[PDB]
Structure 1
Amino acid sequence: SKLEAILSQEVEAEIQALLQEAEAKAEAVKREAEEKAKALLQARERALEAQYRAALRRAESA
C-alpha cells in the first residue's frame, strides 16, 4: 500500500540516518586511532634518533 511503502521507507530512513551517524562516529574513531598511532610512531622515532645519537656519542667517547 501507499502508507505501507511510506512506513517502510520511514523506518528504513531512520535506520539509515542512525547507520550514517554511527559510521561517522566509527570513522572519527578510526581517525583518532590513526592520530594516536602517528603520535606513538613519532615518539618511537624520536626515541630511536636519541638512541642512535647516544650510541654515536658513546662510540666517539670510547
Structure 2
Amino acid sequence: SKLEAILSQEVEAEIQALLQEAEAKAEAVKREAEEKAKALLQARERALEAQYRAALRRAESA
C-alpha cells in the first residue's frame, strides 16, 4: 500500500531522529563524566599540595 510506504517513511524518520537522539544523550554522558573527572582531578591535586604545605609549615615551625 502506498500509505503503508508513507507509514514506512514516517518510521524511517523516527529511526533517523532516534539514532540522532541516542548519540545526543550518549554524547552528553561522556561529556559531563569527563569534565567531572576534570575539575575533580584538580581538586585532588590542590588538596594534596595543600596538605604537603601543612607538612612544610608545621614541621619547620616545630
Alignment TM-score, normalising by the size of structure 1: 0.72
Matches within 5 A, 1:24-43: 24-43=24-43
Question: Quick check: 1:8 aligned with 2:12?
Answer: no
Structure 1 unaligned segments of length 5 or more: list them: none
- Offset, 1:19: 1.2
- Offset, 1:26: 1.1
Structure 2 unaligned segments of length 5 or more: list them: none
Q: Give the % identical residues.
A: 100
**Whole-Å Cα distance in 2 between the matches of residues 5 and 61 of structure 1?**
84
Alignment TM-score, normalising by the size of structure 2: 0.72
1:22 matched to which residue of 2? 22
**Whole-Å Cα distance in 2 between the matches of residues 52 and 29 of structure 1?**
35
